Amino acid sequence: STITTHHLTVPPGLTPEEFQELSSSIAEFHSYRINPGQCSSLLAQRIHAPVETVWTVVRRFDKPQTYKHFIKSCSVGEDFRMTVGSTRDVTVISGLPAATSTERLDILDDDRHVTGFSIIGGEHRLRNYRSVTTVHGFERDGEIWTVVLESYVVDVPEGNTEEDTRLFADTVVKLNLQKLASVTETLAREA
Amino acid sequence: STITTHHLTVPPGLTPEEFQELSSSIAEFHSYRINPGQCSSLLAQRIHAPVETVWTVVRRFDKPQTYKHFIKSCSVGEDFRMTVGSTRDVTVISGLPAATSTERLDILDDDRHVTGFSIIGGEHRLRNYRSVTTVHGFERDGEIWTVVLESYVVDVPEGNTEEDTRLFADTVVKLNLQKLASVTETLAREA
Ligand SMILES: O=C(O)c1cccnc1
Ligand SMILES: O=C(O)c1cccnc1
């Protein structure tokens, strides 16, 4: 059992100067105690849009399809409210027969721009998956931009190397963060 | 048994005027006779780069990782030459235990900018997968751009709707074409 070290390495796609401004947030929100058989990763994405524009999309637990790829549909309860412990049923585009991943909302902090979720049923390739996404505003000489950080911890299935699990989860997260950027930059450029 | 009708519908992300310039090419290269239990799709991507810049990337059968997502590695023979009937072994990022998809190069026409491949082993979700990619130059008042068209035909696995198979294959193709655009536009803007 160890503690992750995401707060001591510059995540790809981030400047060292950006990283050093984010160190405390990475320690607070993007650290995990990991056991053997588990792996963890931290991904970053710079977005040329204001923080609240990005957050408004990131915080919509009931509409992951807005920025995530491979979502066929997302269903929530009839009296769903955006509250910790609530769940969503996501239908992922797998090439396999129709199914659903049940996901639990773990964190929602509208003041600090933190959210996170856990996969609690369905996707057997990501058993014990848990992620946290945070949104951060930057300013330099009157210019503003945003950085989104997303980390996860996950169990490595029996009969898989860590390096294959990480490579799948990283690719999904990185692609989703790219879509988040395009979606919110379009919104920023247009609105 | 029917003939696909990709040449009579405007593919998403294409203007009707672009489509009507491409009708003959869609009929020649992006038509398939499909049997029940099979589905087919045509995808388009506009790229702001010259045709040969895009083609140089599209034609590299031995380096699909340059524009495709989820590729861990690609291996070809020791005396591999870029010739029809040649194969490549691609390791796809599945979240599942390491494996390989064997893919056959079906077409290569450097004069008409046509290529295509078939999956001939591995990916059981895409049995009988076959695609064709063509690259087309456009000009308007001295401005030039490119359009890439990619179609496939594939068997729908037992225990799957067509709509789930198509949605997976379409998402993969569309995402790959997006990467192709970014890769080649970067190359065009920079070089
Ligand atoms: O955020 C998700 O839904 C996700 C991330 C990594 C892998 N699979 C799913
Ligand atoms: O082009 C590919 O490699 C591909 C396209 C669709 C689905 N799976 C793979």
Numbering used by the authors:
A (entry chain A), B (entry chain A): 29 to 219
The authors write:
The binding of the plant phytohormone Abscisic acid (ABA) to the family of ABA receptors (PYR/PYL/RCAR) triggers plant responses to abiotic stress. In the resting state, the PYR/PYL receptors are monomers or dimers and display a wide empty ABA binding cavity flanked by two highly conserved loops, named as gate loop and latch loop. To investigate this issue, we have selected as a model SlPYL1 which is a tomato dimeric receptor with known structure that is involved in the induction of stress responsive genes and drought tolerance. Interestingly, the analysis of the structure of SlPYL1 shows that Glu 151 is not involved in the dimerization interface or interacting with ABA; rather, it is located in the latch loop.
